[PDB]
Amino acid sequence: KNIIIGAMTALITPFKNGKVDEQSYARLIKRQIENGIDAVVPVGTTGESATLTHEEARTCIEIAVETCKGTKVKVLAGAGSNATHEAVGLAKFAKEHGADGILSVAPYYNKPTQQGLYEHYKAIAQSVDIPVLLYNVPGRTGCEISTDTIIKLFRDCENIYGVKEASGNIDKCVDLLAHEPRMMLISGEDAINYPILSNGGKGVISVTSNLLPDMISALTHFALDENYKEAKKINDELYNINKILFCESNPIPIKTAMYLAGLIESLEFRLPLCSPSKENFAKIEEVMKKYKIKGF
Amino acid sequence: KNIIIGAMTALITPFKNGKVDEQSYARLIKRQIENGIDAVVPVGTTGESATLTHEEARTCIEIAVETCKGTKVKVLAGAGSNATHEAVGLAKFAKEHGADGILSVAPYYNKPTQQGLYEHYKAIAQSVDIPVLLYNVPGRTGCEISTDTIIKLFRDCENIYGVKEASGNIDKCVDLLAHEPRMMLISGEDAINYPILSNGGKGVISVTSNLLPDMISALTHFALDENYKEAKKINDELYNINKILFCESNPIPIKTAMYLAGLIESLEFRLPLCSPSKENFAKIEEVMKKYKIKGF
Ligand SMILES: [Mg+2]
């Protein structure tokens, strides 16, 4: 199977006067490349994909593909939907803008059954010939892709090579790799990056990496090189920021942190997303001070 | 405040050969009118709003508005989105198509904060001049509209007149009506229709009403007349069908039941929604036998 693994960043989408800041998006991705990141994830949840137009999502994918041209860094484009016909179209459009693969979230709100999840992802996998990484985050979607459904999709469709697990369920990650050790388990939960990698996970799709790409990159590569003492040391050190980056719902804290570090020019969200409370604002600012934040 | 209350039906959307069966859709709405239903809800979650096109969603609202002209039945159109710019647009389009009000689900998947939820609904309420009913279903959206957020929205915005509670939280229903008794609490959970109405709820937006509109109609109006002994008797008798209609995710059981009762001609869903398991198919068939199902 063709795979996209390693240290990956769920890119924020900076806004300036209500429009997508193309420069800063481009300058932010080059910062990730410069700090050891293996792949970038445009227009995901951390990129506020719910409030982007198809034209804005297509510009962000094109910016990601062009900024990582001539480098080993891949583009794992977010192309998911709770409607299978749309998810197929988003998959085809991401392949056409030059993405090396797609991260397609489980259908949200309409809560499909396991049978429906299988047919949903099977239709996506047979629509394109590029890798497809499953994304299971039940707290946001209301749905859970069972391990049996994940394993069946991995074995029955060739483009599906693994799953992004943001469920806070290390038991399920053992279940996945004990019954299907060839799949690519990817961490979607920054605080438990090392425990997932220590069980055989082959990468992370991080929110923290937006602010500290060098540390998340080093963590992933330490663990993949079986240097668990250094991977756990970085994981322990990132715990405070990994948690505080979820004081409010992602990407509200991480965008606030990028603004506080001067990495973006505006602290603008699109509704229903909003700036955090003064209380959480001070908490993010105070937690950032204990970390060395790389510039441009 | 202008309100839309009473027995209301979350309409299913019948499909035939992958297209919206417009004739059958109109004949299902007229069946609801003839059985005492006070309002119809097009393009809701039970209508598979996630997999409908905007042109298809506009056809369903127009069919509902046209079928309810010359009658007392109002059209509470589904017009929600996890993007406020879209939810505002859907609100404006539903009123322009003749809808008496809109049912606006809480933003799903992207999990806005309470502050974000307030601005989301405030932006929707100030966009149209028709009543707006909040919709809180945390199991599907991943977010919860707090009691304080609902009460603030009810008092600060005039189109907002209440909330459709699908929370399994009779404590919260006491919380809402004890601190703000002027709002219109609507039951979004069929099995607990009577307890919500008996505490001061003024209506239901029902899934069972698709199959048994006369019993949901009689239940609600018995309760509104404080004939609680008869309202509870219908609620107790409906408990078996109210639960079995959620053995799988709504609207999979209700569409299965409508097909089994011959009220819709084809049992078609749009992916990721699918036909139910053969076991649950038999269970739905077995529960229907003990109820008197009205025809056309
Ligand atoms: Mg359900």
Q: What is the CATH number of the domain that holds A39?
A: 3.20.20.70
In a domain, A267, yes or no: no
What is the spatial distance between Cα A223 and Cα A238, in angstroms, rounded to a whole number? 15
Is the residue at B170 inside a domain? Answer: yes
Chain position carrying tokens 């008092």: B155
Would you say A107 and B270 are in contact if contact means Cβ atoms under 8 Å apart? no
Q: Annotate B62-91 with DSSP letters as a single string.
A: HHHHHHTTTSS-EEEEE---SSHHHHHHHH
Q: Is A114 on the interface with B (CB under 8 A)?
A: no
Nearest alpha-carbon partner for B199 in B216, B217, B187: B187
CA distance A147 to chain B (A): 18
The one-letter amino acid at B14: P
Resolution of the model in angstroms = 2.5
* Helix (H), strand (E), coil (C) string for B210-270: HCCHHHHHHHHHHHHCCCHHHHHHHHHHHHHHHHHCCCCCCCHHHHHHHHHCCCCCCCCCC
Q: What is the phi/psi pair of residue A18, to 5°?
A: 75, 0
The reply to whether B263 falls in a domain is no
Asked whether the beta carbons of B91 and B79 are under 8 A apart, the reply is yes
Answer yes or no: do B84 and A48 touch at CB < 8 A.
no
CB B234 within 8 A of CB B275: no
Q: How far is the CA of B102 from the centre of ligand 1 (A)?
A: 22
Three-state helix/strand/coil letters over A181-249 = CCCEEEECCHHHHHHHHHCCCCEEEECHHHCCHHHHHHHHHHHHCCCHHHHHHHHHHCHHHHHHCCCCC
Q: Which two tokens stand for residue A251?
A: 């990407």
Q: In sequence order, which residues have a C-beta less than 8 Å from that of residue B142 and are 6 or more positions away?
A: A108, A139, A140, A141, A142, B108, B109, B111
Contact in structure between B116 and B146 (CB atoms under 8 Å): no
Long-range CB pairs of A180-187 (<8 Å, 24+ gap) are: A180/A150, A180/A151, A180/A154, A180/A155, A182/A154, A183/A150, A183/A151, A183/A154, A184/A3, A184/A5, A184/A133, A186/A5, A186/A8, A186/A133, A186/A162
Q: Do the beta carbons of residue A209 and residue A217 sit within 8 Å?
A: yes
* Nearest by CB: B120 against A115, A249, A272: A272
Query: What distance in Å separates the CA atoms of residue A46 and residue A26, rounded to the nearest whole number?
Result: 16
For residue A289, indicate whether it is catalytic: no
List all residues 6 or more positions away from A105 whose beta carbon is below 8 Å from its beta carbon.
A45, A78, A80, A135, A137, A140, A141, B109
CA separation for the pair A145, A153 (Å, rounded)? 10
According to the annotation, is B46 in a ligand binding site?
yes
Residue B262: CB atoms within 10 A of its CB come to 10
B249 lies in some domain = no
Distance B239 CA to ligand 1 centre (A): 15
The b/e string for B179-195 (b: 16+ C-beta within 10 A; e otherwise) is: ebeebbbbbbbbbbbbb
Is residue B282 situated within a structural domain? no
Task: Give the one of B110, B248, B274 whose C-beta lies nearest to A119's C-beta.
Answer: B274
Q: How far is it, in rounded angstroms, from Cα B174 to Cα B169?
A: 9
Please say whether the beta carbons of B121 and B157 come within 8 A.
yes
Ion ligand 1 residue ranges (Cβ < 5 Å):
B 246, 249-250
What is the separation of C-alpha B273 from the centre of its chain, rounded to a whole number of angstroms? Answer: 18
User: Is residue A215, in this structure, part of any structural domain at all?
Assistant: yes
* B126 CB within 8 Å of a chain A CB: no
Spacing, Cα B208 to ligand 1 middle (Å): 13
Residue A137 has φ and ψ, to the nearest 5°, of: -135, 85
Kindly name the residue from A74, A95, A164, A255 that is annotated as catalytic: A164
Give the best residue of B247, B274, B275 to mutate against chain A (max A CB count within 10 A). B274
SS3 assignment, position A9: strand
Domain count, chain A: 1
Quick check: is B91 in a domain? yes
Chain-centroid distance of CA A24 in Å reads 19
Is any Cβ of chain A less than 8 angstroms from the Cβ of B268? no
Q: How far are the Cα atoms of A85, B37, B67 from residue B41, in angstroms, in the given order?
A: 24, 11, 13
Q: In this structure, are residues B222 and B231 in contact, taking their beta carbons and an 8 Å threshold?
A: yes
Work out whether the CA dihedral B201, B202, B208, B213 comes out positive or negative.
positive
Using an 8 Å Cβ cutoff, are A21 and A266 in contact? Answer: yes
Strand B19-20 with B15-16, pairing: antiparallel
Is A178 an 8 Å CB contact of chain B?
no
Cα A269–Cα A271–Cα A273 angle in degrees, nearest 5: 60
Structure obtained using: X-ray
Q: Which two tokens stand for residue A64?
A: 């990601």
Separate counts of helices (H) and strands (E) for chain B? 12, 10
The CA B140 to ligand 1 mean position distance, Å, reads 8
Spacing, Cα B253 to ligand 1 middle (Å): 9
B229 and A CB contact within 8 Å: no
Mind giving me the DSSP string for A142-180?
A: S----HHHHHHHHHH-SSEEEEEE-SS-HHHHHHHHHH-
Cα(A123)–Cα(B207) distance, integer angstroms = 29
What is the number of helices (H) and of strands (E) in chain A? 13, 10
CA distances for A25 relative to A12, A213, A229, angstroms: 8, 15, 34
Q: Rounded to an integer, what distance in angstroms lies between the CA atom of residue A153 and that of residue A124?
A: 11
Of residues A25, A118, A135, A259, which has the active-site annotation? A135
Closest CB to B273 among A116, A142, A271:
A116
Three-class secondary structure of residue A90 per DSSP: helix
Q: If you ran DSSP here, which 8-state letter would residue B277 be given?
A: P
Amino acid in position B247: C
- Binding-site annotation: residue ranges of A: 46, 205
The one-letter amino acid at B256? T
Cross-chain residue pair A248–B123, CB shorter than 8 Å: no
Asked whether the beta carbons of residue B116 and residue A270 sit closer than 8 angstroms, the reply is no
**Amino acid at position A173, single letter:** C
The domain of A197 spans 6-236
Q: Are A199 and A177 in contact (CB under 8 A)?
A: yes
φ, ψ dihedrals at B205, nearest 5° = -120, 100
User: Are B109 and A48 inside 8 Å of each other by CB?
Assistant: no
Q: How far is CA B20 from the centre of its chain?
A: 19
Q: Which residue(s) pair with B41 in the sheet?
A: B10
Give the strand pairing for B74-78 and A184-187: unpaired
| Structure-block tokens of residue A192 | 């438990």
The answer as to whether A247 is a domain residue is: no
Per the CB < 8 Å rule, is B50 touching A110? yes
Closest-CA residue of chain A to B49: A110
Question: Residue A101 in 3-state DSSP?
Answer: strand
Q: Is A8 left (phi over 0), alpha (psi -120 to 50) or beta?
A: beta
Give the Cα separation of B163 and A156 in Å (integer): 44
Cβ atoms of A250 and B113 closer than 8 Å:
no
Question: Could you give the CA distance from residue B252 to residue B290 in angstroms, rounded to a whole number?
Answer: 20
- Contact flag B274-A115 (C-beta cutoff 8 Å): yes
Closest CA to A248 of B146, B114, B109, B152: B114
| Of A84, A111, A274, Cβ closest to residue B249 | A111
Find the angle CA(A262)-CA(A267)-CA(A271) to the nearest 5 degrees: 160
Q: Which of A229, A31, A2, A214 is nearest to A95 (CA)?
A: A2
CA distances from B241 to B192, B228, B279 (A): 12, 20, 16
A188, HSE (Cβ side, Cα atoms, 13 Å): 26
Inter-chain touch B113–A276, beta carbons under 8 Å: yes
Chain A contact for B84, CB < 8 A? yes
Of A99, A109, A64, residue with least CA distance to A79? A99
Write the burial class of residue B267 (CB in 10 Å: 0-12 exposed, 13-18 middle, 19+ buried).
Answer: middle
Q: Which of B71, B69, B51, B61 is nearest to B22 (CA)?
A: B61
Q: Which helix (H) or strand (E) holds B53?
A: none
Residues after which a C–N gap over 2.5 Å breaks chain A: none
